[PDB]
């Protein structure tokens, strides 16, 4: 959405920049990236937002609510119905806030949370083996710069 995407994000990124340590521009550029600019929506079974822009699974672990999606696979001629468990957060501040503990929690992520610039970041993400993408850092560090632009 025209650049509603950071008037709904920016806040709580901020907060969770400052808890974490992580690149302000650099965790909107992931969700802007990876919900595309937010339209990419995670909605409960009676549409309620999820607010889980990173699109992250339940595990045993999480001792939250979920929501519960259903795609499905033409394979051998066969239809199978697959179903996955979706976190469901409390809002944008408890999503951003979760993805960035995890950041925190882990020293293959140390190069992240104390990265001076966004693009820094992305670069010490792209290390870590994040997306596993070996140009992740430049499909970031283009996000980011556009991110900048708009402020
Ligand atoms: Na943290």
Same mark, same amino acid.
């Given at each position: 959405?025209?650049?509603?995407?950071?008037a709904?994000?920016?806040?709580?990124?901020?907060?969770?920049?400052?808890?974490?340590?992580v690149?302000?521009?650099?965790?909107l550029a992931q969700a802007?990236l990876?919900?595309?600019w937010?339209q990419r929506?995670?909605?409960?079974?009676?549409?309620?937002?999820?607010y889980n822009?990173?699109?992250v699974?339940?595990?045993?672990?999480?001792?939250?609510?979920?929501?519960?999606?259903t795609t499905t696979?033409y394979?051998?001629?066969?239809?199978?119905?697959?179903?996955?468990?979706?976190?469901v957060y409390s809002?944008?501040?408890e &999503?951003?806030?979760?993805?960035?503990a995890?950041?925190?929690?882990? *020293?293959? $992520? %140390?190069?992240?949370t =104390?990265?001076?610039?966004?693009?820094?970041g &992305?670069?010490?993400l792209?290390?870590?083996?994040?997306?596993?993408? *070996?140009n $992740? %850092?430049?499909?970031? =560090?283009?996000?980011?710069?556009?991110?900048?632009a708009?402020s």
């Amino acid at each position: 959405d025209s650049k509603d995407f950071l008037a709904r994000l920016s806040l709580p990124a901020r907060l969770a920049s400052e808890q974490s340590g992580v690149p302000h521009h650099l965790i909107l550029a992931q969700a802007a990236l990876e919900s595309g600019w937010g339209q990419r929506q995670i909605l409960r079974e009676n549409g309620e937002p999820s607010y889980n822009v990173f699109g992250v699974k339940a595990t045993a672990s999480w001792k939250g609510p979920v929501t519960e999606i259903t795609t499905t696979e033409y394979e051998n001629g066969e239809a199978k119905k697959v179903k996955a468990k979706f976190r469901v957060y409390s809002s944008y501040l408890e &999503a951003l806030s979760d993805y960035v503990a995890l950041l925190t929690r882990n *020293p293959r $992520y %140390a190069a992240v949370t =104390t990265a001076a610039t966004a693009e820094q970041g &992305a670069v010490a993400l792209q290390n870590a083996g994040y997306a596993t993408d *070996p140009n $992740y %850092a430049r499909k970031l =560090t283009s996000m980011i710069q556009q991110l900048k632009a708009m402020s």
